Structures are given as structure tokens and as C-alpha cells.
Amino acid sequence: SRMIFDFGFHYSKNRHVGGAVSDVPILVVCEEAHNYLPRSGGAAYDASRKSIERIAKEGRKY
Amino acid sequence: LADPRLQFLFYPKKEDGEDLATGDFADVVRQFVGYMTKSNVSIIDLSGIPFEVLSIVVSLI
């Protein structure tokens, strides 16, 4: 999740030049989610549950 | 310094076509106003310009 997010974050700047958006969109397919994205589980399922929430708010911008 | 777009910033020149001095402040302000007893408007276009200096400009003004 992070090795991708950061890639797009960095790449955006050059292209994004005041009146356009990136030309390299990216889609992520999260299958069978409730395993590693529960409502309430142990700390084990925290890492994957945070790098994701990031994208859920500020990925559209990149 | 090479970037043309960023000239009004780096090499601002007046009607004379020469750099401004410390005494040219007041005129810089009127640039956004006009004068006191005359309804006026000021508009500012920003198309070819990136998003890293936008905020700087805005804060300054």
C-alpha cells in the first residue's frame, strides 16, 4: 500500500501544473476484505488497516 | 531563474522597463486597489503556474 501511495504522491507534482490532474491513474482490488480489514480485531490487523485508510481520504488527489 | 513564467517575480520591470527600488512600494499596493473613493475590482489569473508557489503568493498578498 505504501510503496504505491508514495509513488503516486511523488509523481503527481511535475504533471500537476495548475489546471490538470495526473495521467497515470491506479486502481487497487481488495478482495475478501473482512479477513484483514475487520471492525474490531487484534493489533495484528492494524498495519494493513491504516495504510489503507490513508488512501480512503487522500488518494483521489493523486 | 531561467523559467519565463516566473519573471514578474524575479525580474519585475515598470513602464520604464527597469527594476524597482525600495521607494516603489506604494504603487505595488495600488496595483490591487485603485484608490479610495471609487468602487474598483482586481482579478488575478493563474493557469500556467504550478501549485507549490500558489500558497506563497496568496499568503504574501
B47–A19 C-beta distance less than 8 A:
yes
Q: Helix, strand, or coil here: B13?
A: strand
Phi first, then psi, for residue B19 (nearest 5°) are -60, 155
Alpha carbons A39 and A57: distance in angstroms, whole number: 18
Amino acid, res. A56: A
Residue A33 C-beta-side C-alpha neighbours within 13 Å = 8
Alpha helices in A1-62 (DSSP H): 2-15, 51-58
Contacts of B48 in chain A (CB under 8 A): 17-18
Question: Residue A9 in contact with residue A62, Cβ under 8 Å?
Answer: yes
CA distance, residue B49 to nearest chain A CA (Å)? 5
Experimental resolution (Å): 3.1
* C-alpha distances in Å from residue B2, one per residue of A44, B7, B9, B10: 52, 9, 12, 10
Query: What experiment produced this structure?
Result: cryo-EM
Interface mutation vs chain A, best among B5, B6, B51, most A CBs within 10 Å:
B51
Alpha carbons A2 and B56: distance in angstroms, whole number: 29
The most distant pair of C-alpha atoms in chain A lies apart, rounded to whole Å, by 44
Quickly count: other Cβ atoms within 10 Å of residue A62's Cβ. Answer: 20
Residue B19, strand partner residues: B13
